[PDB]
Structures are given as structure tokens and as C-alpha cells.
Design a protein around this ligand. Structure first.
Ligand SMILES: [Fe+3]
Ligand SMILES: [Fe+3]
Ligand SMILES: [Mn+2]
Ligand SMILES: [Mn+2]
Lengths: 227, 227
């Protein structure tokens, strides 16, 4: 069966040997002959949100994505810095506003949401963002929506995770319920995990410092873990 | 958060170094301090369905499960033999009837289904089994149902997989739709994969020759991949 879309889901690169780890992955993905429609990086791109790390990340990943004709989708994590990411990864004016955006890949909507809280490790979504999200989802996409964020809306199975988990998941749940969100892509946990959130499948990719393949069929979304 | 139930999801042990691989896993799980309510093995237990392999499997796994007070849940795979498994793993009279069974873990229903076809590698579910399954699911379990089987009802992302995939998934889908089946546990693929089937989350554990942790919360089921 041919999927409608193929995505690559990578997370938690933590660049500041993370350079070798990511380099080795990209080289391995290049040799596979995989041709993704988009490559989605679900946060913690730079370990300390360093300008130099973003420059290195961009230098490694942009030629890889260009070779494949794949859209690059960057997401904020708790380790990242909004202003330095905008500047050195995106070529956008520095700002501390949430990195929220919408990207249509043919008929497939990818929504990037920013769960990060500046100077903190836990996750939160502000009122402005929920409203923005609700308004966007009021119009259905032809092939539905993939929501990409950092902190997963799933129960913490480790005590260590609870202190840095996504807070106020109920409010997000109220926005997402009944929408065309078909899957939520996340990171943060540094091990491969899946669950549902208000009936929506959530898939967490492990850290790079493997990744996931995402096959979007007409009726289901398949997430495969690539070590 | 405390889950309602903890399950261990292991698959594709292929015993006939698979002995060392499984031994090393069980020892590792024992050191973790994990106390599962059940341990579910989703098929391909013996590589050639050998009596000796089932004896070895039983010898390795029964003391492990006994130490933890965990229920053992065995599932048929394409590599297994129904008669030899019944005899040497279960202490049951030899039979080639499908290995279908129901196990209540407090309020949680685990249904074991047999997708294997004797002498063949692909998956099928017979009419007798669908009827049996439909009748069982007509009564809801207090905490819903986990369906455990070998061949996953998810699209084959590899060409090699298509020839040995589960056939006639539509019929199974018709039975499961609207039931209290909250999750489907599967194997067969030999890599970690998740998707939905008729709105129901399906989680495939990789092979042993790691495994998954399953945390059942009141409102969601979390699957975590343990390398
Ligand atoms: Fe991280
Ligand atoms: Fe197998
Ligand atoms: Mn994080
Ligand atoms: Mn198999």
C-alpha cells in the first residue's frame, strides 16, 4: 500500500557527541532511499539554546532536506531559546513569542505548537495559543492535521518526568476534541512512547543524542521506530 | 500518577542466541523492580514450534512470572504449533483449534486471539473466531479490553511484510468497532510500530531474538518501548 504522506519524526538532538549522533542518523536515512514529504524535529534542538548550535544544526539538516525536496518543520523544546532559534535557524527577527505556525503539505495540515516556557523545563500552553489553535482547527484540512509539539499530553510513567511534564492538559484537550487532528507528534521523554489523548494518537520519538517514520494512510497513521 | 494496571508486552522470542537474549531481558526486568499484573507474549514463541523450545520457554518464564505474582498470557504466532504449544507450554490436550481465550485481570479483560494459519506465515481469522469474539465483546468489562494477537491489523510499510500480513482485516474491524477494546497488542513485525485500527490503538512490540511496558490509566493506555 502507498501512503498519502511520509514524514520523518526526529527529536531531542541537544546540539551544543550529538553532532556525530545526528550526522550518523542523516547519513543512514540518506542511504535508505526514503523520500519524506516533511522532516519534523519535535524540540530540544539545542541543549543550551546556543546560536552556534543552531548554526550547526541548520548546516547539517538543510542540505539533507533540500536533497530530498522535503519540508523542514522545526519545533521549540524546553532546552531551546525562542529568540536565538528564530535568528539562527529560521532567519526571522528575534522574538520571545511562542513558536506557533501552520504548514500545509498538499492537503495535510501540520500545526507546530510551542509548549516551552522560557527559562523553565516544564510545559505550558498559554490562553493566546489555545485561541489561535481553536480558530485554526475550525476549518478542516483535506487530509486532516498532524499536531507537532514538544511536551506530550500523556501521563508521566516516571517520577522524574512529572516535574517537567506538560501542565493543564485539560484545556488543550477541550480544544482538540472533535477536530481533524489525526496524530500528535512529541518528544521530551527521550524514549519511544505512544498513547492517546482525548482519543487522538500521540507518538513520542526517542532522542538522537534513533527516530520515527510516519506513514499517513487515508484511514490511519502508522508510526515506526527506527533505531 | 498510578496506573490501574501494568502489563509487560514481549514478542517474537523465536526459541529453538534467543535463549541468552530472552534470559538477559528477564534478568534486566527483574532488576528494575517492575511488578506487572500480566506478562503478554504476542506470538512466535518457538521458531519452529518445537516441543523442546516450549519446554525451555516455560522453564525460563514461569519462575519469572511466579516471583512477580503476574499472570502469564501466551499468544500463537505463525512460527508456533498449536498442538505442541498446548501440550508443552499449557499442559492442555493437543489440538489444532485456534488458541482463543479470555482472561480477566481484576476488571481488565484480556482477549487472546489466534491469527496464525497452520503451515503458513500469513494471518487470518476464521468465521468461528469472529463470532466467538463478537459474543464475548457483547458484555463490557469494568476496565475495558486489551486484545492480544500476533499479526497486527495495520498497513504493511514494507513490501516483504505484505505477503505475510493479516488478511481480511475488514471483518475484524466490523466486530471491534464500538466495543470496549481499548488497545490491541501485536508482534510479527520485529520492529516497534503503532497505529490505529477502526479508531483503536494498536501497538507492536519489537522482537526479543527489547519489549514494551503497558500502563493502563483510567482514560488512556500508554505503551513504552524498553530497549
Ligand atoms: Fe530533551
Ligand atoms: Fe516472528
Ligand atoms: Mn524536553
Ligand atoms: Mn510472525
Amino acid at each position: 500500500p502507498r501512503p498519502d504522506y511520509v514524514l520523518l519524526h526526529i527529536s531531542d538532538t541537544h546540539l551544543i557527541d550529538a553532532d556525530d549522533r545526528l550526522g550518523e542518523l542523516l547519513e543512514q536515512l540518506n542511504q535508505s532511499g526514503l523520500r519524506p514529504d516533511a522532516i519534523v524535529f519535535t524540540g530540544d534542538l539545542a541543549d543550551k539554546g546556543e546560536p552556534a548550535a543552531y548554526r550547526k544544526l541548520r548546516g547539517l539538516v538543510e542540505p539533507f532536506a533540500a536533497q530530498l525536496g522535503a519540508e523542514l518543520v522545526w519545533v521549540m523544546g524546553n532546552h531551546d531559546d525562542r529568540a536565538e532559534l528564530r535568528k539562527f535557524l529560521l532567519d526571522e527577527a528575534p522574538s520571545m513569542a511562542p513558536l506557533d505556525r501552520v504548514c500545509m503539505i498538499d492537503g495535510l495540515r501540520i500545526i507546530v505548537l510551542d509548549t516551552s516556557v522560557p527559562g523553565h523545563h516544564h510545559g505550558e500552553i498559554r490562553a493566546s495559543q489555545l485561541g489561535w489553535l481553536a480558530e485554526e482547527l475550525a476549518t478542516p484540512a483535506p487530509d486532516g492535521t498532524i499536531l507537532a509539539l514538544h511536551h506530550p499530553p500523556i501521563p508521566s510513567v516516571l517520577d522524574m518526568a512529572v516535574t517537567v511534564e506538560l501542565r493543564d492538559q485539560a484545556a488543550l484537550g477541550r480544544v482538540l476534541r472533535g477536530t481533524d487532528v489525526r496524530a500528535i507528534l512529541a518528544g521530551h521523554l527521550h524514549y519511544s512512547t505512544n498513547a492517546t489523548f482525548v482519543g487522538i494518537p500521540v507518538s513520542v520519538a526517542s532522542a538522537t543524542c534513533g527516530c520515527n517514520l510516519v506513514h499517513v494512510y487515508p484511514d490511519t497513521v502508522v508510526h515506526s521506530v527506527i533505531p
